Every structure is written in C-alpha cells, then in structure tokens.
Amino acid sequence: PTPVEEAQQKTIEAITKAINYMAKRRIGALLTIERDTGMGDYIETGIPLNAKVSSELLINIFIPNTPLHDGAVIMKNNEIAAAACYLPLSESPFISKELGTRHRAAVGISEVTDSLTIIVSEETGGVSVAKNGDLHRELTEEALKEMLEAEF
Amino acid sequence: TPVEEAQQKTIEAITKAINYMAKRRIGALLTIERDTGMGDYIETGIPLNAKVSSELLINIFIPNTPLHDGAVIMKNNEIAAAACYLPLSESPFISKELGTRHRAAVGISEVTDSLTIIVSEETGGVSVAKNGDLHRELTEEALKEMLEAE
Ligand SMILES: Nc1nsc2ncccc12
Ligand SMILES: [Mg+2]
C-alpha cells in the first residue's frame, strides 16, 4: 500500500472506533467527510481545528454539554478541519419524522455536495449515513466500515 | 504585528479555558514549550497539531473522556498533543495536599524552561509551574501576567 492508502486506512479506523463508542453511549454526533465538492463555506462557520484525526479527539468533541458538541464536524482527508459547523437543513420528506436536526442537517449537506455524513442518534444510538440526498439508517458496524472503504 | 496579535489571541484562549475549568473544578494540565524542546514528551500523547481555541482546550479536559488524563503540550502556537506523560517531581517542597497533576507540572518544570498551568480538581485553584517552583492560588490577572511575561 502507498502512504496515502495507509493514511486513509488509519483515518477510517479512527472514525469507526469513535462512531462505535458514541453509538454504545447514545452520544449524538454529526460527522461530514468532504469529498470532491469543497465545503469551505461550511468549515468557516465552525471553530477551526485543522487537527490530526484520532478516535479520541472525535469522541471528546461530541461529549454532551461541551463547547464543541453542537453542530457538525467537517473532515478534510486526514484532518478534522472544524467543529460546531452549520449545515443546511433538508426539507426532504424521506427523513423519518421522529428524527431531529442532526439527521436533517446531514441530509441537507448531502443534497448540495458529494460528501458522506455519519450521524449517531442520541435517542437510540443508531448509526446512519447521508449521501446524495438519501439517508441510510440503522447501520451495522460492518456496513459503516464498508461504506467508508468504498468512499475511499 | 501579526505575530503579536496571534500571541495575544492564544493567551486569551488559554485564560478563557482555564477560567471555565477553575469554576467547575475540572482538573487540567497545560504545558507550553519554550526554548527547551519537548518532543520526547509530546511523542507520548495523542497527536493533534491543532489550532488553539478555548473551546478545544475545554473539550479536551472534560472528565471521564479519552483525552483528559495527561498533559496538553503547546508548541509554536498550536496544541501539539494531549494526554501526554510528564515526569513526576520528587521535590519535598511541594504543598503536601497536592497530588500527581501538580507534581507532574513541577517535574517537567525542573528539566525544561516551559511554563505549565494546573487546575486543581479538588479546589478549582489555578497554579503555574516554572523553574521547579509552583505558584499557587493565582487570580486571573496573575495568570495573564505570567503568560505575557513568558
Ligand atoms: N505523570 C503525569 N503526567 S500528566 C499527569 N496527570 C496526572 C497525574 C500524573 C500525570
Ligand atoms: Mg435497514
């Protein structure tokens, strides 16, 4: 594997470990991974981090009742670019009515970019992904990992 | 100048975070590298290389979280790493009521020119370690004077 490929693999591992921990504890989370459509306008709404990605940092960001926990984390390649970012809310009727603002923000950004967003529900611990305007719910750990590996 | 504005913004981020921690009696340990290189201690932690903000500093030190045990080390105006190991002082001249956070701060200050800021989890008191000494029960103004002097 090239260094770029190894680094990607270390980022996926960090992301999946953090999401798995938060799902178990019902820690709400909203994590958008920038792809080929630039997310600069949404990164500038948040607190800048420009940090190396770790499972530990991702977890600490989303602990309830803390300064960084509300809003989205936006990742650019192997960095956490910013936290507490604003994303636009989708009006799609295919978002389950019981879902709150994190899921609607995730679908929202996914309608205007090619990003992949991961959502952990604070109600149920369920893991979802928003991509291309669609929300995919109740993901197993394996499903999520495969989704991330496919996103490369 | 830009460098001057950056240093002031960093001082202001740190003091805001420390004041929030002190109010809530959240234990914290924040070392600022100076001329003596601290790469061997930075290596023991989780790498961040992150922009400083009061928000990030607070999120790092929340109790019962992955990053809260150990020291934050700052270098070149950025958070280099969190959850870092610092050497425990063996000095017999530290207040006997204090524990390992304060002895770690004094320890690193014995072997480097760094400045360490400590928030006590018992009292919310704020102290600074430098040159082997611990300066206790600092006000906000006192801490800012220390940072500006440094
Ligand atoms: N040896 C240490 N390095 S950081 C820290 N924090 C609390 C107690 C000990 C230590
Ligand atoms: Mg299903």
UniProtKB/Swiss-Prot annotation, chain A:
The residue range of the signal peptide is none
Q: Which domain of life is it from?
A: Bacteria
The residue ranges of the DAC domain are 2-141
Enzyme Commission number(s): 2.7.7.85
Instruction: Output a single Gene Ontology CC term carried by this record.
Output: plasma membrane
Question: What results from gene inactivation?
Answer: Increased sensitivity to the beta-lactam antibiotic cefuroxime (CEF), upon overexpression of the c-di-AMP phosphodiesterase GdpP greatly increased sensitivity to CEF. Double disA-cdaA mutants cannot be made, suggesting they are lethal, while double disA-cdaS and cdaA-cdaS mutants are viable. Depletion of cdaA in double disA-cdaA deletion cells leads to cell lysis. Exponentially growing cells are extremely sensitive to H(2)O(2), no change in response to methyl methanesulfonate.
Q: What is its main location?
A: membrane
Q: What class of enzyme is it?
A: transferase
> Where in the cell does this protein reside?
Cell membrane
- Keyword Amino-acid biosynthesis in record: no
Induction (record text): Constitutively expressed, part of the cdaA-cdaR-glmM-glmS operon.
Q: How is its activity regulated?
A: DAC activity is stimulated about 20-fold in E.coli by coexpression with CdaR.
Output the Gene Ontology terms for molecular function: adenylate cyclase activity; ATP binding; diadenylate cyclase activity
Listed A to Z, the keywords are: ATP-binding, Cell membrane, Membrane, Nucleotide-binding, Nucleotidyltransferase, Transferase, Transmembrane, Transmembrane helix
Q: Which family does it belong to?
A: Belongs to the adenylate cyclase family. DacA/CdaA subfamily.
Summarize the subunit comment.
Answer: Probably a homodimer. Interacts with CdaR. May interact with GlmM.
Role this protein plays? One of 3 paralogous diadenylate cyclases (DAC) in this bacteria, catalyzing the condensation of 2 ATP molecules into cyclic di-AMP (c-di-AMP). Upon expression in E.coli leads to c-di-AMP synthesis. Probably the main producer of c-di-AMP for the cell; is probably implicated in control of peptidoglycan synthesis. In B.subtilis c-di-AMP is a second messenger that mediates growth, DNA repair and cell wall homeostasis; it is toxic when present in excess.
Indicate what this protein is called per its UniProt record.
Cyclic di-AMP synthase CdaA
Instruction: Tell me the name of the encoding gene.
Output: cdaA
Please indicate which part of the intact protein appears here, giving the first and last residue numbers and the full length.
Answer: 103 to 253 of 273
